[PDB]
Amino acid sequence: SQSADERIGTFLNQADWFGLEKNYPILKDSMQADFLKLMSEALIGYYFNRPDEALQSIHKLLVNHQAEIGGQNALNMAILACQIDGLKGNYATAAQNSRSIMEQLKQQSAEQGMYKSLEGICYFYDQLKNIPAPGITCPQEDIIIPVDIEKVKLPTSIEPKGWRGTTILIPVTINGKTYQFIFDTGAGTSYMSQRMAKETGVRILSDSLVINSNLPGAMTGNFGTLENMQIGSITFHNSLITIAPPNEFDSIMIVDAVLGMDFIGLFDEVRIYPKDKKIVFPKSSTPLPSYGRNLMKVDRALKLKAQANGETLMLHFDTGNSTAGLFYQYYEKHKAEFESIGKKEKITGGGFNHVVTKDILRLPSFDMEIGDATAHLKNLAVDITPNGIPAEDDGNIGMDMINQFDCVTINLKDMFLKLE
Numbered sequence: 001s002q003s004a005d006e007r008i009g010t011f012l013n014q015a016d017w018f019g020l021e022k023n024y025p026i027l028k029d030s031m032q033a034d035f036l037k038l039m040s041e042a043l044i045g046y047y048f049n050r051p052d053e054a055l056q057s058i059h060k061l062l063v064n065h066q067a068e069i070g071g072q073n074a075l076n077m078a079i080l081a082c083q084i085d086g087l088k089g090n091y092a093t094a095a096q097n098s099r100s101i102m103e104q105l106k107q108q109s110a111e112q113g114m115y116k117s118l119e120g121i122c123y124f125y126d127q128l129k130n131i132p133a134p135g136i137t138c139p140q141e142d143i144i145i146p147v148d149i150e151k152v153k154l155p156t157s158i159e160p161k162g163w164r165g166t167t168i169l170i171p172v173t174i175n176g177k178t179y180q181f182i183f184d185t186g187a188g189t190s191y192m193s194q195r196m197a198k199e200t201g202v203r204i205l206s207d208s209l210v211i212n213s214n215l216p217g218a219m220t221g222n223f224g225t226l227e228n229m230q231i232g233s234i235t236f237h238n239s240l241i242t243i244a245p246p247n248e249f250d251s252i253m254i255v256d257a258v259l260g261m262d263f264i265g266l267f268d269e270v271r272i273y274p275k276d277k278k279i280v281f282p283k284s285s286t287p288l289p290s291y292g293r294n295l296m297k298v299d300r301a302l303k304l305k306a307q308a309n310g311e312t313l314m315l316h317f318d319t320g321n322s323t324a325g326l327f328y329q330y331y332e333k334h335k336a337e338f339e340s341i342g343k344k345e346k347i348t349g350g351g352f353n354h355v356v357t358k359d360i361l362r363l364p365s366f367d368m369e370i371g372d373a374t375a376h377l378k379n380l381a382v383d384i385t386p387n388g389i390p391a392e393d394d395g396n397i398g399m400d401m402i403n404q405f406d407c408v409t410i411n412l413k414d415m416f417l418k419l420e
Contacts, residue, residue, distance in 0.1 A: 003030070003031075003032075004027045004028075004030035004031045004032075005031050005032055005033045005036055007023065007027060008020065008023070008024060008027055008031060008036060008037075008040055009036060011023065011024075011040075012036075012039065012040070012043070017043065017044070017047045017048075017296060018292075018293065018294075018296070018305060020040060020043065020044060021044050021047070021048050021293060022292065022293070024040050024041075024044060028040075034064070034065065035061060035064075035065035035068055035069050038057045038058075038060055038061040038065065039057075039061060039069070039073075039077070041053055041054065041057040042054045042057040042058045042061065042077060042080065042081075045057065045084075046080060046084060046297075047296050047297060047298070048293065048296065048297070048415045049265075049297050049412055049413070049415055051084050051087065051088045052088075054080075054081070054084050055081055055084055055085065055088075058077050058078070058080060058081040058084075059081070061074075061077055062074055062077060062078060075101070075115070078097070078101055079098070079101060079115070079118060079121075081097070082094050082097050082098040082101070082118075082121060082125075083121065083214075083299070085097065086121070086124070086125050086215075087216065087299065087300065088133070089132075089133025089134055090133065091125050091128035091129050091130075091131055091133065092125075092129040092130070094121075094125040095122060095125035095126040095128070095129040096129075098118060098121050098122040098125065099122050099126070101118060102118060102119060102122050105118070120209075120210040120212055120215070120218075121212075121215065123209070123210065124209060124210075124212065124215050124217070124218055127205055127206040127209070127223075128205065128240070131205065131225055131238060131240075132237065132238040133238065134236070134237065134238050134239055134240060134262045134263070134266065135236075135237045135238060135266065136234055136235065136236055136237065136263075136266050136267075137234070137235045137237070138233055138234040138235070138281070139233050140283055141283055142280055142281070142282050142283055143232055143233055143234060143280065143281040143282075144232075144278055144279075144280050145170060145171065145231060145232045145278065145279045145280075145281070146171070146277060146278055147168055147169060147170050147171070147183070147277055147278060147279050148168075148169040148180065148277065149166050149167070149168055149169075149274055149277055149399075149403065150166060150167060150169060151163035151165075151166055152164050152165050152166060152167050152253070152322040153253075154252065154253060155251075155252070158252065158348040159348075164322055164323060165321075165322025165323035165398065165399050165400060166322055166399045166403060167182050167183075167319075167320070167322055167399065168182065168183035168272065168279075168319060168399075168402075169181065169182065169183070170182075170183045170231065170259055170279060171231070171232075172229055172230065172231050172257070172259065173229075173230040173231075174200045174226070174228070174229055174230070175200065175201065179196075179200075179256075179257055180257070181257045181258060181259040182255070182257070182258040182259065182320055183259055183264075183272075183279070183319055184258045184259065184260050184318070184319055184320035185260075185261065185264060185302055185317055185318060185319045185320070185410070186260075186301070186316065186317075186318030186319065186320040186321060186396075186398075187258045187259070187260030187261060187320055188215075188216030188217070188219070188260060188261055188299065188300035188301065189216040189217045189223075189239075189240045189241065189242055189260050189261060189262045189300070190239050190240065190241045190242070190258060190259055190260040190262055190263060191219070191241065191242040191243075191244065191255070191257070191258040191260060192224075192241050192242070192243055192244070192256065192257050192258070193243075193244055193254070193255060193256040193257070194243060194244065194245050194246065195256070196256045196257050197224060197241065197243045200226060201226075202224040202225065202226050202241055202243065203224050203225045203226065203227070204222065204223075204224040204243065205223055205224050205225055206221075206222065206223055207221070207222055208221065209221050209222070209223065214299045214300075215299075216240070216260075216261065216262065216299065216300040217240045217241075217242055218242075219242045219244075219352060220242055220243065220244045220245065220352060222242075222243040222244075222245070223240060223241060223242050223243055224241050224243050225238055225239060225240060225241060226238075226239045226241060229263075231259075231263075234281065236263055239262055239263065240262050244352060247352060247353040248350075248353055248354070248355055249350055249351060249352055249353060249354065249355060251355065252348070252349070252350060252355055258320065261300045261302075264410075264412075265300075265412060267281055267412060268285045268411065268412060268413035269281070269282055269285040269286060269409065269410065269411045269412065269413065270409075270410045270412075271407060271408065271409050271410070272319075272402060272407070272408040272410070273406065273407055273408075274402055274403045274405065274406070274408070275406055276406075285411055285413055285414070286409050286411055286418060288411075288414045288416055289371055289372065289416060289418055290371075290372065291371040291372060291416075292416070293414065293415045293416050294306070294370070294371060294415075294416055294417055295317065295410075295411075295412075295415040295416055295417055296314075296415065297412075297415070298392075301316055301317075301318075302316075302317040302318075302410075303315065303316060303317060303393060304316075304317040304370065304397060304417055306368050306369065306370050306397070307368065307369040307370075308366070308367065308368045308369070309367075313330060313368070313394035313395065314392075314393050314394050314395075315393060315394060315395045315396065315397040316393045316395070316396040316397070317397060317417065318396050318397070318398050319398060319399060319402060320398070321396050321397070321398025321399065322398060322399050323381065323398055323399065323400045324377050324380055324381070324395070324396065324397050324398050324399075324400040324401060325360075325380070325381040325382065325383065325395055325396050326363075326366075326380065326381070326382045326383065326394060326395040327383050327387065327389075327391065327393060327394060327395050327396070328383045328384070328385060328386045328387060328391065329391040329394060330382075330394035330395055331361065331382050331383060331384055338361055338363065338382055339361075341363060341364060342361035342362060342363055342382065343361065343362045343363075343364070344359060344360075344361060344362075344384075345359070345360055345361070345362050345381075346358070346359055346360075347360050347381060356387075358383075358385065358387070359384060359385070360381050360382060360383060360384060361381070361382040361383075361384050362379050362380065362381060362382070363377075363379070363380040363382055364378065364379065365377070365378050365380070366378075366380040370401075370417060370419055371416070371417065371418060371419065373405070373418075373419040373420070375397075375401045375404065375419070376404065377400055377401065378400075380400075401419075405419045405420060406420055407419075407420045
């Protein structure tokens with residue numbers, strides 16, 4: 001039998017963010033440790049898309065409780081609020097406070113240690129401090145966008161049938177011309193080819209950023225902005241755009257324009273109707289289902305909490321992934337079984353400036369429960385070897401799941417995925 005402060009402290013130690021988010025509301029009124037309540041609200045708001053709540057809690061925590069949370073925790077929370085400020089588009093606030101932290105670090109002679117990564121964060125938002133945050137205007141109504149769902153053509157030297165999976169192409173109009181953009185929840189920010197940015201007259205903002213995995217907009221080194229983008233009756237203002245130069249991945253496929261999370265994150269809810277080939281941005285949101293919140297946001301990545309044979313697995317929710325795959329860490333947990341039913345296969349893929357060819361495993365069929373629904377993934381790729389990414393998720397769920405439903409409800413206000 002444990003106190004409310006002990007139980008909440010366990011959720012933090014275990015890094016059980018779904019557990020923390022679900023239990024904090026009822027346990028809150030039984031806690032005595034104000035610093036621990038504040039740290040809970042900050043970590044919840046970070047992971048479940050409540051940035052202003054997190055910011056207000058971090059600030060109150062650093063006003064009142066620095067001495068009892070300890071030097072490193074105070075520093076960790078101050079840095080968290082910087083990246084929260086940055087992901088919100090408070091560019092000036094992020095660039096100012098992180099510079100201020102760098103300066104305090106230098107003076108305690110602790111900056112060349114394990115916070116030298118804070119230096120690129122200061123450089124990143126210092127390039128943006130005079131740029132408006134992303135924003136939309138749109139009428140108060142259900143906004144219905146016709147889309148295409150097309151096979152992803154690949155050269156037959158890498159995919160003999162000439163395609164691999166699908167992608168959602170959403171019409172975007174810029175300066176009177178209408179383009180097709182990929183609708184990519186996996187894109188931390190919107191993204192353009194060098195030729196797309198020149199044609200659309202993108203305002204280039206930097207040429208020399210440190211390429212950062214968790215910084216949305218530092219994927220290639222060059223980013224820029226666009227004042228005005230038209231998606232139906234929606235107008236998208238001051239997009240932050242990653243600008244990619246010609247690279248080796250072009251020999252796999254040319255990616256000209258991608259509509260990413262700087263746009264998508266501005267909505268309470270997005271509904272994808274694959275069979276009807278439409279995206280709806282509704283006036284009112286869907287109610288939070290039975291099964292609760294099953295989405296989580298780590299920086300810019302949406303992560304789906306799913307089940308497979310009664311065991312939890314965490315999936316990067318990435319519509320820019322044309323099929324679906326499971327990562328090494330999950331394979332390793334089920335090695336013998338997957339070695340049993342699995343078929344070894346060579347796949348060629350990659351991303352910006354890397355074309356990889358490796359051995360994988362294809363599972364004939366893999367059933368996973370997503371809330372009240374079951375996704376049936378056929379011919380599911382499985383990494384049998386760690387794939388040069390620090391293991392975090394159990395897999396990356398993409399269009400192979402989306403296309404087998406009539407309505408995919410992505411709700412960001414309350415952080416859930418619903419499939420009907």
